RNA sequence: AAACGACUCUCGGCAACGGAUAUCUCGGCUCUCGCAUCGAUGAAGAACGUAGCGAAAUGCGAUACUUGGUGUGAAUUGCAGAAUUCCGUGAACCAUCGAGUCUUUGAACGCAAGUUGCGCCCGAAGCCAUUAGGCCGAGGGCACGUCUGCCUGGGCGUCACGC
RNA sequence: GAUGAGUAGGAGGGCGCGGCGGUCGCUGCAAAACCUUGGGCGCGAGCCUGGGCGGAGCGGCCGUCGGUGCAGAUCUUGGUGGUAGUAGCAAAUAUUCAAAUGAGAACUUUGAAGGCCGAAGAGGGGAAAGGUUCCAUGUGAACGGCACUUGCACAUGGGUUAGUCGAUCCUAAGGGUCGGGGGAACCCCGACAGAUAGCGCGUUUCGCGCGUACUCCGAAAGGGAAUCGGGUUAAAAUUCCU
RNA sequence: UGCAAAUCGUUCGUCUGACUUGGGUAUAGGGGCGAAAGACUAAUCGAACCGUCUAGUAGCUGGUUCCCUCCGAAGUUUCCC
RNA sequence: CCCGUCUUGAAACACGGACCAAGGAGUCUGACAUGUGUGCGAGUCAACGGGCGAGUAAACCCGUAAGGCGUAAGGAAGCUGAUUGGUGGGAUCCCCCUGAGGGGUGCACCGCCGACCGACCUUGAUCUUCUGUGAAGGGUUCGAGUGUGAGCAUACCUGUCG
RNA sequence: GCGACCCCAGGUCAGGCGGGACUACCCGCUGAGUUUAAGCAUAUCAAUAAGCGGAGGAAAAGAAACUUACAAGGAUUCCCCUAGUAACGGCGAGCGAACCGGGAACAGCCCAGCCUUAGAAUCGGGCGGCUCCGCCGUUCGAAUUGUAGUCUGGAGAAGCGUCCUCAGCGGCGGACCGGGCCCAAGUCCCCUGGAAGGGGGCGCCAGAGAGGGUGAGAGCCCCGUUGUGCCCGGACCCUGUCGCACCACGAGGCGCUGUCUACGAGUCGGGUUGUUUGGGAAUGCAGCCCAAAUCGGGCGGUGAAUUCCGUCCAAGGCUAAAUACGGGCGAGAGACCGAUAGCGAACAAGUACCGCGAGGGAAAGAUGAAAAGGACUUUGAAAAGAGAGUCAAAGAGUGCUUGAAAUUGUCGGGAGGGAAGCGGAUGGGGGCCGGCGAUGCGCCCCGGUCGGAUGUGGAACGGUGACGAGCCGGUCCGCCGAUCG
């Protein structure tokens, strides 16, 4: 049960906030869980999805597919993967949008900031 | 309740005037001007599109009620008495087939429980867990417009745990379990003792609260300590067993 | 010979016309709570501009859908192009604010106004001109009523000293 | 056992809609809504159900609440008929022939003929008013009350060049003001209750002499400094070139 | 149910003056203006137009939404601008 | 005979109604009143406020000589302020006898007549601060009074009124 | 002619101040009528709407020239009550306070005048310094037609005693506020599905089952929620502690006094006029006339005279809190509305559009999970049609969830001498209905399965009684007989 007086349980307000979230907030909203091996290694549960991350889909028609992320369309709330595509009536190939919550991260693109965020996340869990 | 009412100016933000008779149209006031779809249309009427409703709702409606304290206490005592009848508790929809005895009085050690898992184990031990499980399983989305009015989920009512120690941790331990409600013996609420106005709430008493009941509600002979000058009401019938009276020796002779 | 057909009417299937019904909702209405912050240091309002590709809405002011600092940490995206030691002074139609820019007006202030109309003053730099002044002009000034102080003045208004 | 009329009106018991507190359920093996010469229950308000469609929710029961039940109000908003392929298309004398283009020509363009406006024009320019309607190219839909290949429509581009033409300057009827006088104040009168703006001469930039309380707005027809030929564009010219 | 919320056709009055007309300017609602018709004052005039008081008040006109069941009238008395 | 309406009278040569969908009109609030349900009862009412408390607009608790209504009325006012009944019917119950009987009991309500309080009138021993008191005795007068309380709070329908 | 002062004039002189904007609350002025009175004029509407001004976060009011008549209260403000009361009113319609009492909050103060005269001890500007919201030095100026200090009626001045009280800085925390970072649990097996988030099974977290998103009802997929931990910045105010110097000249407190004791004028008050109020021989306010006093003056709700009594001290000023709040910024909620509803506006809405102008003022939301937004063939001038393709679905094809009625086309059935429709009764035709309409039961023979006492032991248990004894009793299991159902 919510107790903080500065947070609202209003459905209208929650939906408005989610759908008007700016890009920085959308990055956090577009988080995905880590695979079992990465979870065990880093003591972290979920991470924001990055462009160069390796991702395995776990829901939908592409449940078995995996590949590198190639675009994070925050405006559309989706990500695009290397070979997860489809053919149009024209015959040309187009990537299929996948929601990050429906995928699993198998390999992270690590930099100084990514390592610092991983350490911060692991510290609280202990 | 929270008051509701339409805007007092709604349907009156126009300078509309009646055309009068002689134009082969109704006498309802009509918007002035021209060059727009609104011009010439009716206004100010409860039967007019975009008009003012009949008898607009107002905030100074009598929302609240002032019931005598004695009647409130009568209702609370009646609900408490009904909670001790297994037939009424079953009739109210509670699964009490596995309860050892009613009223259900448990050891005061339950008041020190801190974890929801331990609270669940205590419920299983005392036999009140089937009712909580039924309440959890009944979780569903509210039908109708209420689901979009910030009342999305409805469910059945589980046990009500009455404790007698201020600041006990069992409130925290139990508050997350669906259907389970908690209350202090000194501030019992009729809304929880008789949900929906129906008697026979399933209640789990701590020993301290059960002991304090006598000092709170007194008795027929002596007065209450916590309620100044209050005495429990008496029924019009001393013995409600009608068969015993009707088939007694005196009447049948 | 009032049969077949046409017409009218009627019932049914299908197809039209129209947008009712049902399910929705980043909107409204109502109640409650916290805070006290516009302007001559030029407010509110009003005009004109500004994007590679925009008319409106939103934003902004010739540094013009943004400059700068800080935080976050890899986008924006309708299309095209360009960045980014992407293990980093570092993307972002990201967030936030301390630095900075902020056109014509408007209480609007040199005079006006159906006029980008009509005046006066100071002056950086530059041209040749030399203890001399000229051309040009970046840029900035010149409303009213008042307060304190000051400068320059008027009147036998009240006096005094001399002639 | 007796009995049965009912406008105005009163009351009782019930049906139906949407929420709230409870309770019992249904639903992607298909909810709501809607559709149906399917079937049934009730005197009735209504209710239950088959089939279809629809594609995400809904219902029964006990209390309780309300912006809760329509055939009318020349009722409101929206939608739709008969009228009806009907009334109409008729003022301003008038068109015809051949060819070109085009899917399509009575209506576009060329030529020829026959007519009209008849110089106080149906010609050639301006003021106000409009604001791109101006010029070139192209054109699906709409519009041009028939039609269009077309165009004052639509789309993409282009176009308005001044020392001499005007505004700008002056003042007209008048307007707006200082001070003063009124006014609770918004404001009223308007040079009328008053130490005016300043203007000339020589200069150590100071002196001398004049100085009647608005040096403001008000005319693209009043007054008024100055340009003429010739040529030039798809569209500008006393403005561009000489 | 017009080309037109005043027009069209023929006819008709005056036509150097109390003539006609453009622009500027002044007079604004119980006010203006009127060779005077209660005329005109933006299709509005015996008191313009716009917003508000305002959901103005009406003994008067029109409507007033489900079912069954029971009971069931009055147009007469007195007083009242 | 076409519905709705006004009407003594409508199928009317009486008015509205071309057709369909959706919207569309005795409501909320304040003061009273009868009735009914509920609590308590010579009392009743904690929600002005305070203490708290579902981490909480709810619920719970709190009346000190608080306050409202009731518990006393009559007078313009000064002011005074209920001596506590009787009787005819009458429900229920108890006795004797089984008649439409007799005796006891006599609530509610109704009829009649006393008494008490007060306005007015009348009356007057004794005391008394000299203007008060009141032994006795009253009245075709008047009251929204007394004679062993019946209210207070709250819910709803109906009715008058703003 | 010079000088001093006074009044005034000009300065683009040096440095400051003001105008206007917003509307919910707040302060001042001005000010109706509709309406009610069943007419209407006083009255009511209303000390309201409209109009003209002025502030803040609150404003205004505020420290008795008060309330009362008591055994007395003690600034202002607000709530309950007083009370629909006293009073006012063509005493009609109507209107209508205040004191006491109970609560919320509380807070008191500053001036003018007689009182330095051994010297204006006061203040502003320039300039130069400093630990710079200020202090110091110097110089000009203001001011004696009075700046400082003391004093304000509760007092106070002066005098004498008491020895009772009074003097800052800096550090570290607490309190308040605003922010930043991390931290629980499944996406395990089977099925239907385009997609599980649906059903079934097996697990887990919970001081987190508020809420939202994701391809359908998601506690454990994601953001969040609960509760800790850590980090950053304001406010220099309140609060605890610590380190150092802590000076009583002077000023306050207390007691005494054969002395003084200064207090607001065209103001109070009165007459009259108008307005307002419940204020009634006149409640306040304002115009005009008159016009005070200091052993006095105002009030004491009936005018006037006389004698007492009670209570305060106007005509100068400041002041937080309790209270108000349809505007601004920022939040939380709802038995509210759900696109003809709800604000006029869910959308480039105060927009398009209308009016010379003041002003008036709409309509308009929904493809799909994902554009995967329909390639290509063919006919046509083209719009498009017929095929074909995408999708779970085009029976979802960009004004794209669903798609009622009025009204219309087509096919099929039927009827029709100047309406149609309708009530009641049959009939012809059609349509529909198999709970539309049964096939069991009893007695015997054969065969197959399952159990068979009132006997004997065990398990648990019940009726009654007294949730004791005693009596009685059913279910299940194991055996000897019985040989039945
Ligand atoms: K048909
Ligand atoms: K920035
Ligand atoms: K000019
Ligand atoms: K339900
Ligand atoms: K059906
Ligand atoms: K209900
Ligand atoms: K062509
Ligand atoms: K003046
Ligand atoms: K003047
Ligand atoms: K001119
Ligand atoms: K030339
Ligand atoms: K008028
Ligand atoms: K009448
Ligand atoms: K009628
Ligand atoms: K008719
Ligand atoms: K009482
Ligand atoms: K009397
Ligand atoms: K000085
Ligand atoms: K002084
Ligand atoms: K004094
Ligand atoms: K004084
Ligand atoms: K006076
Ligand atoms: K006195
Ligand atoms: K609207
Ligand atoms: K569909
Ligand atoms: Mg709908
Ligand atoms: Mg409603
Ligand atoms: Mg001529
Ligand atoms: Mg052209
Ligand atoms: Mg002046
Ligand atoms: Mg001039
Ligand atoms: Mg009392
Ligand atoms: Mg103040
Ligand atoms: Mg009372
Ligand atoms: Mg008080
Ligand atoms: Mg100084
Ligand atoms: Mg679905
Ligand atoms: Mg999580
Ligand atoms: Mg139809």
């Amino acid at each position: 049960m919510k107790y903080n007086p500065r947070v609202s349980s209003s459905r209208r307000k929650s939906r408005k906030a989610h759908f008007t979230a700016p890009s920085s907030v959308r990055r956090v909203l577009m988080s995905a869980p880590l695979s079992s091996d990465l979870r065990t290694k880093y003591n972290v549960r979920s991470m924001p999805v990055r462009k160069d991350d390796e991702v395995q889909v776990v829901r939908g028609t592409y449940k078995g597919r995996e590949g590198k992320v190639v675009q994070v369309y925050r405006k559309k709330w989706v990500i695009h993967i290397e070979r997860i595509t489809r053919e149009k009536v024209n015959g040309s190939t187009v990537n299929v949008g996948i929601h990050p919550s429906k995928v699993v991260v198998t390999k992270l693109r690590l930099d100084k900031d990514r390592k610092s965020l991983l350490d911060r996340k692991a510290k609280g869990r202990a | 309740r929270q008051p509701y009412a339409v805007s007092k100016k709604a349907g009156h933000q126009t300078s509309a005037e009646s055309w009068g008779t002689g134009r082969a149209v109704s006498r309802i006031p009509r918007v002035a001007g021209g060059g727009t779809h609104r011009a010439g249309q009716a206004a100010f009427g409860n039967m007019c599109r975009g008009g003012r409703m009949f008898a607009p709702t107002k905030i100074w409606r009598r929302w609240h009620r002032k019931i005598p304290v004695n009647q409130k206490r009568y209702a609370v005592a009646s609900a408490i008495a009904a909670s001790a009848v297994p037939s009424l508790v079953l009739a109210r929809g509670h699964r009490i087939e596995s309860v050892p005895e009613l009223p259900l009085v448990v050891s005061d050690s339950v008041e020190s429980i801190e974890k929801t898992s331990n609270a669940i184990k205590a419920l299983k031990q005392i036999g009140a867990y089937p009712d909580a499980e039924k309440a959890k399983d009944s979780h569903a989305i509210r039908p109708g417009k209420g689901k979009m009015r910030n009342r999305r989920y409805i469910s059945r009512k589980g046990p009500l745990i009455v404790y007698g120690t201020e600041g006990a941790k069992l409130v925290k331990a139990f508050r997350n379990i669906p259907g389970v409600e908690i209350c202090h013996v000194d501030r019992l609420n009729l809304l929880k003792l008789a949900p929906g106005g129906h008697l026979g709430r399933f209640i789990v008493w701590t020993k301290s609260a059960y002991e304090k009941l006598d000092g709170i509600y007194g008795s027929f002979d002596k007065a209450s300590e916590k309620k100044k000058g209050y005495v429990l009401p008496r029924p019009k019938m001393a013995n409600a067993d009608l068969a015993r009276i009707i088939n007694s020796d005196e009447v049948q002779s």
Side-chain angles (χ1 to χ4, degrees), chain B residues 220-232:
Chain B
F220 280 17
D221 46 340
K222 72 183 188 177
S224 163
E225 322 203 332
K226 300 286 165 294
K227 303 180 190 297
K228 202 231 68 202
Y230 175 76
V231 179
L232 287 172

Side-chain angles (χ1 to χ4, degrees), chain B residues 2 46-47 54-55 60-62 65-74 163 166 172 175 186-191 226-228 233:
Chain B
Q2 279 188 214
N46 62 316
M47 89 288 282
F54 157 75
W60 56 79
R61 187 215 300 275
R62 257 187 83 234
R65 293 296 182 259
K66 162 145 79 65
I67 296 287
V69 183
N70 198 252
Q71 256 166 339
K72 296 163 147 193
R73 289 166 170 157
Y74 203 133
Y163 67 102
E166 288 283 350
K172 309 276 181 280
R175 68 186 187 188
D186 284 299
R187 37 174 177 284
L188 295 177
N189 191 356
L190 175 69
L191 296 176
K226 300 286 165 294
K227 303 180 190 297
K228 202 231 68 202

Side-chain angles (χ1 to χ4, degrees), chain B residues 129-151:
Chain B
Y129 185 69
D131 209 45
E133 196 194 320
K134 173 261 286 152
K136 176 166 173 57
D137 291 325
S138 61
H139 178 80
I141 282 173
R142 185 194 289 269
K145 76 179 71 169
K147 82 174 75 61
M148 91 196 54
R149 303 278 177 81
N150 297 317
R151 318 178 284 279

Side-chain angles (χ1 to χ4, degrees), chain A residues 50-54 107-112 114:
Chain A
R50 212 205 184 274
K51 190 187 175 183
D52 277 309
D53 286 349
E54 224 61 2
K107 190 212 55 50
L108 296 146
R109 192 211 137 270
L110 289 176
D111 53 74
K112 221 173 295 228
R114 216 96 192 275

Side-chain angles (χ1 to χ4, degrees), chain A:
Chain A
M1 178 70 241
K2 172 262 284 186
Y3 293 124
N4 178 351
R6 285 208 89 65
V7 53
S8 170
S9 317
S10 163
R11 172 179 177 85
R12 161 173 186 193
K13 282 183 174 182
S14 315
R15 277 172 59 73
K16 182 150 142 101
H18 168 264
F19 283 105
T20 55
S23 181
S24 45
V25 178
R26 286 204 191 198
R27 150 168 186 291
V28 170
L29 294 179
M30 274 171 97
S31 279
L34 294 190
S35 75
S36 212
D37 321 65
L38 294 181
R39 228 169 227 190
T40 36
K41 158 175 196 157
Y42 289 122
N43 207 45
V44 175
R45 189 161 254 265
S46 61
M47 278 303 264
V49 71
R50 212 205 184 274
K51 190 187 175 183
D52 277 309
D53 286 349
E54 224 61 2
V55 150
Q56 180 186 330
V57 177
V58 295
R59 288 279 161 109
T61 63
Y62 309 100
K63 183 172 184 174
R65 304 290 290 283
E66 55 212 62
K68 184 191 82 83
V69 172
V70 293
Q71 182 159 250
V72 186
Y73 223 126
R74 293 184 183 164
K75 199 188 214 277
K76 293 190 140 273
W77 300 98
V78 279
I79 59 167
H80 294 139
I81 318 170
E82 253 174 346
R83 289 154 257 91
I84 284 86
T85 71
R86 94 187 307 291
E87 301 337 319
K88 297 164 59 58
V89 183
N90 249 332
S92 47
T93 326
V94 284
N95 286 270
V96 169
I98 306 293
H99 202 263
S101 70
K102 298 288 149 289
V103 316
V104 156
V105 184
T106 58
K107 190 212 55 50
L108 296 146
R109 192 211 137 270
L110 289 176
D111 53 74
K112 221 173 295 228
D113 283 352
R114 216 96 192 275
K115 287 209 210 67
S116 149
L117 177 57
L118 274 167
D119 161 46
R120 276 182 284 146
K121 277 180 171 269
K123 268 187 73 172
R125 198 177 280 275

